Amino acid sequence: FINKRIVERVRVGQILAVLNRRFVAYKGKMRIMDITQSLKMGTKLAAPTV
Amino acid sequence: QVYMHRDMLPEPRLDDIERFRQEGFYYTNMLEAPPEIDRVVQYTYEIARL
């Protein structure tokens, strides 16, 4: 017994019911870049901060 | 004392060509005297950064 719907009996027209979930996908136009290695010491910013 | 200011190049009329026995309109950057302080905008690198 698992109390998790692993294998389930379905109708047919019900197949697509799975959909459900949200999902946000970055448009092809955009470029995802990790600014993680830009943490060198000798870099100063124009906006001083506290 | 070094400033920048949108300045026209003197384009004189030439009716009496002989009258150009004048100082041939020499023109210069050399200001006879500096600007009115309330008309000047003092820039520090600091501000320009921002």
Residue in chain A nearest B45 by alpha carbon? A46
B49 shares contact with chain A (CB less than 8 Å): yes
Residues of A in contact with B49 (CB under 8 A): 46-47
CB-based contact B10:B4 (threshold 8 Å):
no
Give B48→chain A minimum CA distance, Å. 9
Between the two ends of chain A, the Cα-to-Cα distance in Å is 57
Residues A24/A30, Cβ–Cβ less than 8 Å: no
For residue A47, list chain B residues with Cβ-Cβ distance below 8 A. 49-50
Q: Is the CB of B50 inside 8 Å of chain A's CB atoms?
A: yes
A41 vs B7: CA distance, rounded Å: 44
Provide the H-helix boundaries in chain B.
45-49
What is the rounded CA–CA span in Å between residue B24 and residue B19? 9
